[model samples]
Target: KPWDTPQLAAELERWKLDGRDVSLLIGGPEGLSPACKAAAEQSFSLSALTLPHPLVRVLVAESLYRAWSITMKLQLVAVGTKMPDWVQTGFTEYLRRFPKDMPFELIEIPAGKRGKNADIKRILDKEGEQMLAAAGKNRIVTLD
Candidate 1:
């Protein structure tokens, strides 16, 4: 069903205790089947914008990360993302328009710096920790 974050969050918070599964549907060419559209869920637009559909997953994800800063209502200390230097001009421009009171900053954890190999675990552990740490008090979606 169509819903807002406050509605979804309450359901999520409740279901979180039960460990229920959640799903999101980005309508197909037919534009979401009745069954698909009938599902219960919703959230932060990352705003309230003319965002993308399936393509927006990554974009939405980045926006959601920044939304946390909004959740705290600080106007963000900064909004961060790990993107190539070449891309910063556009990235910077977007963030520049972001409200100064909510000082959106970009925090990057760029790749290609590690020198070691033959050990996926090493890379995974280090990179993973860096990511989780940057996220502050977040629960890592790890599998047993």
Candidate 2:
């Protein structure tokens, strides 16, 4: 399978263990040369989708921050219902790829009951209560 963010996170963790110094080289219009690739110990494909040079740079920086943050054993808590098969597969796959010491966890909060024009506020209130209770005293960061 092609490399992704979580794989990079694991790589960063390994680098720490080996006390390795890593350098990232971004290609220009022509991309890296054959010799450059030959000299590198490993190569990574961010995604199969094509991306511009500027965007690639930003992604690399962002990925470094994300992967580094993963080493802190961050908990990914969210309130949601059941997931589709594909969604669950992808989630589980990535979870397995993360560094062992810094495992990622997902706390799923079942969505409040719903019917024809069910009370939206009440449902949200109940869901919020469940989410907070699950989160406990840990610092929470809301995602937009």
Candidate 3:
């Protein structure tokens, strides 16, 4: 099954309650060894699309961290593009104060290109896709 963050978080919570020690085996470009796969009790995927090797580790780590956070408190994930220095500074200042109480992350996606004669609709659409990709399976509350 394609396991998203919330689903994984719930499973992690159950595992914690059950006191199970789990190991995640990551595969290389060629993929996991068949023998190892057969030995595993079950299998799940983070995403349906093929992810790059380096990216997979980061995703896995973040997923684990997010799941752990969920067990303690609700988390907030803000996915957006880079902002002006003043805006970013203000956001950073406020965000820094939250972790002690809540777990939150600010995910920045690169803004699509823009130039003379650039298609506004296309650029916005592409940016939206990037935002959605970063948001993953988490429930989202969009601003404007």
Candidate 4:
């Protein structure tokens, strides 16, 4: 699996742990055979977009170099019923620092219908479910 920017930092740190062997296979034309891919413990692609067979070699090394420059960064994803105006500017500012090589993913957790004066318990339960659903596999943090 490809590691996100944050995971890449952690993975790089792992390299420092007790001496070991790390082998990276770079090939042309047809990708590694199923048997070869299966032999490896993990496989990760550089991007969602595919590159020309020859171009891939340059990118893999280039991405590695970029990774070295910015070694400790993580992704930020927010899930909420609605986005406020300030979110756009602030989010974009930070994202400028992160090139597409380290991308951002946003997921929204929609809110449930309610009246002007709604039941407290009902609101929490319903919205909580919605936010949790939006959270999916990651941690959930709320801000008013």
Candidate 5:
């Protein structure tokens, strides 16, 4: 149950910060024993697809990293189907309202299959830099 320990540790760390932890528990091939199930604080269904145990561990690691990165505000830039015009407008209005120490901007990414391609990635990277300059703040949070 060494794997169980890290998951619990991560949960405890986040809880100490007053943050919510979303736990994903994958049963072994034979499934969880009653004792294991009773020990779980919560449970989640990862996907409709059945994944192997090793693959599930990798997925869980990635999920935990992403969750930690987001909570720590290490990554920003929301990606979606299309960039909204209102985001720019809202950014401008926010600047006007605050006029001092404005911290962030909502960058828009155009909607399309191309959204996930390398070109969009480059654009977002460049735009992210520009946004940091304009806001004069290094903090940005992206919603995907």
Candidate 6:
């Protein structure tokens, strides 16, 4: 079984606006279904090392917060000082291309072990709307 997790925090919105693709995937205790595995553009072995899923979520959240703080500090520095033309070009272009008035936020609906498939689908549908509302977008945009 496969389940959808909520968005990352609002801080990650800048990355999306900057054209970075963000995705979250969850697998059953038995691991990814064949269709899900096939659909992935790339895959890594999170199992290479053992971790409890709850702990992994906490670690990931902390890391993302730190990254967001660093990015905000960098942006402030760029605003206060003279940056190189290329740096300005890249950052400004990114902002211009992906204007964001609000940050991205994630909502998680936990699927305990042995969760039903229908529950997963309902969670996804609900969260998808929440994310779009947070995004303040009138229509869905497909990256592809």
lDDT of 2 by residue, 1-144 (tens): 257677778888988987779987768876899889898988886556465332332344345447877634455555555554444565556545765554446566777767797988899898889888888888887753
Instruction: Give per-residue CA lDDT, model 6, range 72-124, as digits (tens).
Output: 21111000123345444553443344324324233344333335545656655
lDDT per residue (tens digit) for residues 117-138 in model 3: 8997898887788777877777
**TM-score versus the correct structure, for each prediction:** 0.34, 0.45, 0.37, 0.30, 0.22, 0.26
Ranking, TM-score, top scorer first: 2, 3, 1, 4, 6, 5
Per-residue lDDT for 3 in model 1? 56
Q: How close is candidate 1 to the true structure, as a TM-score?
A: 0.34
In order, candidate lDDTs are 0.50, 0.65, 0.62, 0.54, 0.47, 0.44
Q: Candidate 1, residue 54: CA error in Å?
A: 16
Whole-model lDDT, model 2 = 0.65
lDDT of 1 by residue, 1-98 (tens): 33566766787788788776866656555565776545645433223434333223336435755765675332221223344455546745665666
> Which runs in model 4 stand beyond 4 Å of their true positions?
1-81, 84-98, 113-115, 137-144
Candidate 5 residue lDDT tens string, 36-97: 78988766444444543323323433454455456322332333333244443443453355
Put down candidate 4 lDDT per residue, 1-144, tens digits, no spaces: 564667667766886794677777755666777778778866777565454333332334345446656863332223233334544455445435655655444444444555787876786687667657656676554543
TM-score of 6: 0.26
lDDT of 5 at 51: 49
Judge candidate 3 against the unseen true structure and give its global Cα lDDT, from 0 to 1.
0.62
Query: Could you give me the TM-score of model 4 versus the true structure?
Result: 0.30
Which model is ahead, 2 or 4, in terms of TM-score?
Answer: 2
Best by lDDT: 2
Q: After superposition, how far is residue 42 of candidate 2 from its true place, in Å?
A: 46
Each model's backbone clash number:
7, 0, 0, 0, 3, 2
Write down the worst ten-residue block by lDDT for model 1: 72-81
